[PDB]
Amino acid sequence: QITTELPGRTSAYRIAEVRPQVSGIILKRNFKEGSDIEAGVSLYQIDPATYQATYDSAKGDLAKAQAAANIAQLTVNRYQKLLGTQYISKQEYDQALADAQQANAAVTAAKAAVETARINLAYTKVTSPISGRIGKSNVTEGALVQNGQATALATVQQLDPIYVDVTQSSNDFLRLKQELANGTLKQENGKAKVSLITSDGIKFPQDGTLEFSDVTVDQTTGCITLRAIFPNPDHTLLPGMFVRARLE
Amino acid sequence: QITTELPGRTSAYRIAEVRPQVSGIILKRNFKEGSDIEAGVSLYQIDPATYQATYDSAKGDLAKAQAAANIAQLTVNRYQKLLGTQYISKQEYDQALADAQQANAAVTAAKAAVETARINLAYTKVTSPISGRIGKSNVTEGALVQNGQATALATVQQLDPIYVDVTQSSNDFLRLKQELANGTLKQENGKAKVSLITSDGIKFPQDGTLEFSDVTVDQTTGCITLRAIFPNPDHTLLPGMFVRARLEEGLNPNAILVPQQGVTRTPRGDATVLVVGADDKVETRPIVASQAIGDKWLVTEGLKAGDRVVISGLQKVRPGVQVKAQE
Amino acid sequence: FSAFSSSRWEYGSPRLERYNGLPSMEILGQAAPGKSTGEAMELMEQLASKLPTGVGYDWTGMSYQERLSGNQAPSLYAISLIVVFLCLAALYESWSIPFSVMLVVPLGVIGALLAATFRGLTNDVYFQVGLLTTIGLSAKNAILIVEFAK
Amino acid sequence: LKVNQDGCRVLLRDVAKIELGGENYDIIAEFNGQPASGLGIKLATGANALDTAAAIRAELAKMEPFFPSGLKIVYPYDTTPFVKISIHEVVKTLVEAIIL
C-alpha cells in the first residue's frame, strides 16, 4: 500500500545557452525575457554597417577577380584557336594559361572573401539556436560584446516534458537496492509512473514518468540522476524546485 | 475584497550602455551631466578630417574611375560602331570591354570607399542610441579614446515608464495558481493595476499597471521575478527602493468570515466550530477553517449566512441543552 | 520564515502541574452540606477504582490534615478519662468512690448539644473547648458537692 | 549533518552508533550468578528505623506487581534482620530474664 516519498530537484527537459558568435556592439533586442522563443527567431541585432562595408568590399573584389579572370580567359580563348601556326606558339599560350591559373587563384581568394563576409554577414544578426522558453537577457543594447566570450546571451528552456534529478546517497542506495532486490519498485524496469508532490502538497494532476535503470552513480556520494522525464503540459513546473515524489 | 501587500523590486524601463564607437581625441562634450538625453543626441566629437578627405578624395577617384571608364566605354561603343568589317580586332573589342570591366570594378571599389568613409564618417559623431535620463559625464574635453576599448562612456534609463520586477515567494505563487484556479480578482488577465505603497508612506498618485503572467523563476531560492511597467511622469522613483504594492480588492465576495471567538482548533490536528441545533440543543460541525482574515476567519466548508452560530454561554452548555438566542 | 517554515495547530495547556514532582491536575471539590468529606473520600476512592493501571491520587488541603488524622481526640478523651479516674482516685483517696462523679461528666454536653441545634451550629474547635468548659465547670462544681459531703 | 550542494546529506549517526548511555560503565556488581540492583537505603540523621523498616517492607509491598518478567526482589544486604532481630533477640532474652 504505496511506498516511500523522497525529494529530488527538477530540471528542464532541455536548455540551450545562447552565446554570441560575432564580436561587436549590441543593437536592438528582438524579444522579451521568459517568453516562448522558437528556433531562428531573431534575438539581438549587431550593427551590420561594418559588415556592410565588409560585404560590399568582398563583392567588389569579387568583381575584380571577375574582371582579371575575364582578361585571362579571353587571352586563352584567343590564343587557343591559332596554335601550331605562325600566329601564336606554345610560349605565349602558356603565358596566357599562367594568367588563367593565377586568375583562378584570384577567384579562389575572391570566393574565400565572399563566403567569409557572407557567413560573418549571417552572424551579424542574433537568432535563436533552438525553440522553447527563454531565460533572461544578460547584456543591454549599445554594448560591445565578443565572439566566443564567456558571457552568454541567454538560455532558453524547453518544457512540455520536464526532468527531475533524483538524489540518493550511497548509504541507502543499498536500501534502494533493497527495494530493487525486492523488485517492488521496479516492474516495467524502464520507466513507470511516480506521483508528484510539490510544495503546497497539492500534487501534479497526473503522476510522472520515472526512469528506473539509469542509476547515475556519483564518484563521491552515489547520488543518482534518474532522469525523471515528467509531463509538464502547463509549461510552468519551474525547473529548480526541490519538490518530492513517492513511488508506486 | 481582500488581496496581499508585499515589497516589490522596482527596475527602470531603459538601461543603456554608452561606449566609444571610434578612436580619436574627444573634442568637446555636446551635452550635459544628469540631463534628459533623447535618442540621437550627438555625443563626443572626434575630428573627421581623415575620413572627410578620404571620403571626398574617394568620390573624386570615383569620378576619375567613371571618367576613364566612361571614355573607354565610349571607345567600346566605337568598336560597336566598327565591328562590321575587318577594321577593329575582336581581341581588341573584348580587350577594351574587359578593360571596361576592370575600370567598373574600380568604380565599385570606389563606391565601397565612399560607402566605408561615409559609415566611419557617421561614426565620427557619436549619437545617443535611445532616450531618457543620463547620469553624469565620465569623459571631459580634450580626452583621448580608442575604438572597441573595454571602458564604457555612460548609461541611460527611462522613468516615465518604469518596471517593477515583483519579488515573490514560491508557494504562494501556487496560491496565485490557486488564483489561476480562481481568476476572479485577476481582471483583464494579462495586466491590471496594483496600488503602490512607497517609502514616504504616501502611495504613488496613480497606482501601477501590473503584469500578471510572467514566469521568471529563481534557480536557487524560487524568488519569483514578475516585471511590471509602471507610470511615473515625475521620474522620481528609482530602480531599487524597495517599495510595497498590493492587488485590487478583491476576489469572490461569498466568504465565510466568522470572528475568532467560536473558532476552535478541535480536536488534535483538527478544527470544528460548535453551532446550536435547530431544537436549541447545540450541534457542532467540523469546518475547514482557512486563513484568519482581520478579526475573523475564512471558512470554506459547509456553512452559510444565517446559520445560528453562537457567542457566549458555551461553557455552561454541552451538546444537549436548549438555548434562548441573544445578540 | 515561510521560505522554510511550515506550521500547524494543536492543543496544549498553559498551566501544567506536578504534585510531589508527579504529573498532577488540580481537582477541587466541595461537598453538599450535611455530608463529610471522608464520605467523599470513600466515594471518589471507590471511583478511583474506575482508573487505569499506574494511577495514583491525593487528598490534601485540610484534607491533608484529616488525611493525617481527622480525630485522635477520642484517644485523648479515653486517656483523659483514665487520668481523671486515677487523679480522683487520689483526691477521693478511695477505691471506685470517684466513679460517681464520672456519671456527671456527660451532664454538661446537654445544652451544648441541644442549644447547638436550636441555634443551629455544629462541631469545631470552639465547640470542643465548649465541651471543655462544660465538663470543667460542671464536674468542678460536683467536686465541690462530693467534697462538702466528703 | 553536512551536505553537498546537491543535498547529498548526512543524517545522524551514519559514522557512529546510537544506544542508551550508561553514564559510566565501570561497576560490575554480581549477586549469585548475575548482577542485580542492590539499593542502599542509608540511615538518615534523625531517622526512626523500626516502623520505617516495616514500611520499607511495605514499600516492597507497594511496588511488587508492576514489574517486568523475571524481575526479582531480595534484601541482599539488610541491617534490619540483624538489628530488628538483635532487639527481638536481645529484648526477648531481656524480658524472659525478667521472668527469671
UniProtKB/Swiss-Prot annotation, chain A:
UniProt GO cellular component terms: plasma membrane
Coiled-coil annotated residue ranges, if any: 48-122
Protein keywords: Antibiotic resistance, Cell inner membrane, Cell membrane, Coiled coil, Lipoprotein, Membrane, Palmitate, Signal, Transport
Subcellular location(s) of the protein: Cell inner membrane
Protein's membrane topology: Lipid-anchor
GO molecular function, one term: transmembrane transporter activity
GO biological process: bile acid and bile salt transport; response to antibiotic; response to toxic substance
Functional summary from the UniProt entry: AcrA-AcrB-AcrZ-TolC is a drug efflux protein complex with broad substrate specificity that uses the proton motive force to export substrates. This subunit may act as an adapter protein that links AcrB and TolC stably together.
Subunit (UniProt): Monomeric in solution. Homotrimeric; interacts independently with AcrB and TolC as well as AcrZ. Part of the AcrA-AcrB-TolC efflux pump.
Record family assignment: Belongs to the membrane fusion protein (MFP) (TC 8.A.1) family.
Protein name, UniProt field: Multidrug efflux pump subunit AcrA
Lineage: Bacteria, Pseudomonadati, Pseudomonadota, Gammaproteobacteria, Enterobacterales
UniProtKB/Swiss-Prot annotation, chain B:
Keywords tagged on the record: Antibiotic resistance, Cell inner membrane, Cell membrane, Coiled coil, Lipoprotein, Membrane, Palmitate, Signal, Transport
MF terms in GO: transmembrane transporter activity
Membrane topology: Lipid-anchor
Coiled coil: 48-122
Subunit structure: Monomeric in solution. Homotrimeric; interacts independently with AcrB and TolC as well as AcrZ. Part of the AcrA-AcrB-TolC efflux pump.
Purpose of the protein: AcrA-AcrB-AcrZ-TolC is a drug efflux protein complex with broad substrate specificity that uses the proton motive force to export substrates. This subunit may act as an adapter protein that links AcrB and TolC stably together.
Entry protein name: Multidrug efflux pump subunit AcrA
Organism: Escherichia coli O157:H7
Portion of the full-length sequence here: 51 to 377 of 397
UniProtKB/Swiss-Prot annotation, chain C:
Compartment annotation: Cell inner membrane
Entry superkingdom: Bacteria
Record topological domains on the Cytoplasmic side: 89-98
Outcome of gene disruption: Loss of susceptibility to contact-dependent growth inhibition (CDI); inhibiting cells still contact the target.
Listed transmembrane segments: 72-88, 99-118, 125-143
Periplasmic topological intervals: 119-124
Disulphide bridges: none
Function summary: AcrA-AcrB-AcrZ-TolC is a drug efflux protein complex with broad substrate specificity that uses the proton motive force to export substrates.
Induction: Positively regulated by MarA, Rob and SoxS transcriptional regulators (at protein level).
Subunit structure: Homotrimer, with large domains that extend into the periplasm, interacts with AcrA and TolC. AcrA may be required to stably link this protein and TolC. Interacts with AcrZ. Part of the AcrA-AcrB-AcrZ-TolC efflux pump.
Family: Belongs to the resistance-nodulation-cell division (RND) (TC 2.A.6) family.
Protein name (Swiss-Prot/TrEMBL): Multidrug efflux pump subunit AcrB
UniProt organism field: Escherichia coli (strain K12)
Coverage span on the entire protein: 801 to 950 of 1049
